[PDB]
Amino acid sequence: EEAPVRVALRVRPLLPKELLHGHQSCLQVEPGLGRVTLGRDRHFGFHVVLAEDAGQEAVYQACVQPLLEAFFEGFNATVFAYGQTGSGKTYTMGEADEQGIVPRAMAEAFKLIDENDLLDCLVHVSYLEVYKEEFRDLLEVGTASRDIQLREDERGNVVLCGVKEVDVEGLDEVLSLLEMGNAARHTHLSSRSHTVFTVTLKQRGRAPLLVSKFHFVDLAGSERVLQINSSLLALGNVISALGDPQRRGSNIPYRDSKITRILKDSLGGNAKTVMIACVSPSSSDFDETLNTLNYASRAQ
Ligand SMILES: Nc1ncnc2c1ncn2[C@@H]1O[C@H](COP(=O)(O)OP(=O)(O)O)[C@@H](O)[C@H]1O
Ligand SMILES: [Mg+2]
């Protein structure tokens, strides 16, 4: 009935391009100790640390599978990928073998539905982009931003008005929708916008209403030019508050951004949340890697 935000760090390999430009790793990663060392003497610990050799299935098992279980119990869940552009958020979240979190979680969801034969289940999905505090519905997109509203009901549940929700019965249908949403996003950068893929599960007793939501979010790139003036800083403020024993029982400032408002019922409290902080090990990215390590640390 209450749980901390779980923070996972994912370190990707140094990329060919980075190697060819003369860069080398500035991170020593110790997965079994749950920790990393930046440069010579900057040490950071996280709930889960995944090294460059951790494959997609390993990330999914470490970070996401336990959310999937709470989702079917009727808890809300979110997994978000955070980090600078180029760090591996999209690769990790898998919405665009090498398949990422979304296809694996959806594959498992439909198997669970098949297994729970005493429940009658309905699943629908929405797929939204947030850019400069305006929504675009990627499954419609003929939808004016002004016609999508984010509200909250009396029981604290987030209510979307004007967003397309599509019933799905299998992974094939989910993959098809993701392909079209991703096509629709282009015909403004993907690294300056957030995307939110929301899966809603409605379960009723007898013969395959408890309602839960699982959000999969691929956040805007965290890089900075160098107080709360950005959606990433609003999200960081919220997760900081939740992780702070003095602040966590006080008023959590969800209202500051659309991203924190849409996740309000699915971020800490009674919901289960995992942040996957993605980092480049490249020495060329030292400063942004430090920024992400520090941001992720504030959530613990
Ligand atoms: N864990 C990983 N293993 C191998 N390649 C990766 C990994 N993470 C990211 N990459 C690659 O690094 C590049 C940037 O990844 P991407 O997912 O686009 O990052 P972001 O979404 O954070 O900008 C892509 O070419 C991607 O294939
Ligand atoms: Mg990306």
Author numbering: 9 to 104, 112 to 202, 209 to 229, 240 to 257, 271 to 344
What does the literature reporting this entry say, word for word?
Kif7, a member of the kinesin 4 superfamily, is implicated in a variety of diseases including Joubert, hydrolethalus and acrocallosal syndromes. It is also involved in primary cilium formation and the Hedgehog signalling pathway and may play a role in cancer. Members of the kinesin superfamily of motor proteins (Kifs) move unidirectionally along microtubules (MTs) in an ATP-dependent manner. Kif7, a critical regulator of mammalian Hh signalling, acts as both a positive and negative regulator in the Hh signalling pathway but performs this role differently from Cos2 in that it does not interact with Smo or Fu.
Despite four point mutations (Kif7E226K, Kif7R268L, Kif7L269R and Kif7H295N), the overall structure of the motor domain remained unchanged (data not shown). Kif7 contains an eight-stranded β-sheet core with three major solvent-exposed α-helices on each side, displaying the characteristic arrowhead-like structure typical of all members of the kinesin superfamily solved to date.
